[PDB]
Structures are given as C-alpha cells and as structure tokens.
Amino acid sequence: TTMASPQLMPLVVVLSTICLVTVGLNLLVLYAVRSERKLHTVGNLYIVSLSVADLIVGAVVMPMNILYLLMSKWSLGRPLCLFWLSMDYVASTASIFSVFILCIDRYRSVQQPLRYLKYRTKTRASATILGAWFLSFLWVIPILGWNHFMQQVRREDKCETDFYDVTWFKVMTAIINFYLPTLLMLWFYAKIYKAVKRQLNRERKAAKQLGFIMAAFILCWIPYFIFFMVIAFCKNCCNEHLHMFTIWLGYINSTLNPLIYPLCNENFKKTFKR
C-alpha cells in the first residue's frame, strides 16, 4: 500500500513532533502579540509576518511532506499537490522576504534615527508586509502555468513542480530568490553592526535578535541552496539523503525562529512566562 519499511518510522515519529512544535510555537507567538498592547510596535509587525509564514510552512507543508515521505507517492490529487507546492514555495520565499523587509527597516533606522521617522507609521509597515506577501504569492504563476507559458507533470510516481527539468529557470530563480536577498541582507546587517558596535543597550539586543534570525536563515537554508545549485549541473548526482536532510534543516530553521524570539527580547519572555 505504498508503505515505508519499518526502519523509516523512527524518524517520522519525530518529524511529527517537529511539525506539532512549529505550530505550537508560532501560534503561541501570534497569540502573544494579539494578547498584549506592549507588542504592537513597528518591528513586531514584521515579526508577526514571519511567524505567519512559519505557521504556514509548519502547518501546510510539514504534514503533507511527512505523509509524502512515509508514502513514497503522490497519486493523492493533482490540485492538492499543486496547492502543496504553491503553499511551500510561497511560504518559504515569504519568510525570506519578510526577513528582508525587517532588515531594510532596521538598516534605515540605524542609518540615522533622525531622517527615517516619518516613514515608520504602522500603516506603511503593513503595506510593505502586504507587498512582500504579494511578491511571494507571485510564485503561483509559474507552478500553475508552466504548461501554458513554455510549450511543454505526466509522472505519477511522484508529483513535482513543472520546471524541475528546466535547469536554466531553476538556477536563475535560485540565484535571485536566495542570493540577492541574502547578499543585500548581509550588507545591511554589516552596516548596522558596525554602527551598533561603534556608538556605545537595547541596541545590543535588537541587533543580536536580527543577527540570530539572519544567522538562522543563512546557516540553515544555505545547505539546501548550495546543493540545489550544484545539482543543477551534476546529473549523475542524486544523493536523496542529503537533500532530504537539508530541506528539513530549513524546516528546523522555521521551527527555531519562534525559539529565537524569547532569548532575544525581554517582553517576549515576560509574556511567554505565563
């Protein structure tokens, strides 16, 4: 019945725990924000956007990915697989765009906290978050319309994105979506950290929070992306174990961010203590 060998259970039994902990922590963060007035700041809007993206990548893709791992097939509804892809790619890129927006906001604030003050109303933070989410949801077009744009799954042993066999698009979208946000974020973070070390202490807790979030990303997703852009050329080169572990390393990052917040802010630990 497309089962898995009894030696593949002792890891799914903990993947389910990771799935439940991701949605038990992100939901806790979200309820913390909507239960206390002190947490309706500007950067907490970006934190909420990140927590929502992690809730989606912990509640929609985690159980579907676990079921796909346990049952090595996806003859389980073509539109359902399309929805899983459209809620995996969009969530994973929305997390990295929300982090990018937060990093730009903090870099503008640390630029000079006398010139970026009239562009920090919460309405504009919400507008930027909605714009980032729109750019993320733009990922629906290629997945659902590659058979319409390029005159080209038809593979029922496993459902996959329609451009998996398109090396040029894969490498180009990987380069853009990861590297350019990653490079820009690293540049902004270095520019922040220089000034923060320069002046002086809430700055050396907020800078550490942003640095830990960025470290989480650039250190838990890059094992996936280096493999993704080395596999785009090597075709006799298909180690499934490393790929399957790197994807779940990124998912562990999604789980870790809700643990990152308590250990970098006192307000979050004060509202998590009860």
Ligand X SMILES: COc1ccc(CCN2CCC(Nc3nc4ccccc4n3Cc3ccc(F)cc3)CC2)cc1
Window 185 to 244, contacts with ligand X (CB under 6 A): 221, 228
Residue 88 contacts ligand X per CB under 6 A: yes
Residue 254 contacts ligand X per CB under 6 A: no
Window 58 to 87, contacts with ligand X (CB under 6 A): 65, 68-69
Alpha-carbon distance of 179 to 225, in angstroms, equals: 9
174 or 252: CB nearest ligand X:
174
117 or 244: CB nearest ligand X:
244
Asked if residue 157 belongs to a known ligand binding site, the reply is no
Determine contact, residues 100/132, Cβ cutoff 8 Å. Answer: yes
Asked if residue 179 belongs to a known ligand binding site, the reply is no
Asked if residue 31 belongs to a known ligand binding site, the reply is no
Residue 133 contacts ligand X per CB under 6 A: no
Residue 159 contacts ligand X per CB under 6 A: no
Asked if residue 255 belongs to a known ligand binding site, the reply is no
| Nearest residue relative to ligand X (C-beta) | 92
Torsion 216-17-161-148 (CA) sign: negative
95 or 271: CB nearest ligand X:
95
Binding region for ligand X (CB under 6 A): 65, 68-69, 88-89, 92-93, 96, 173-174, 177-178, 221, 228, 247
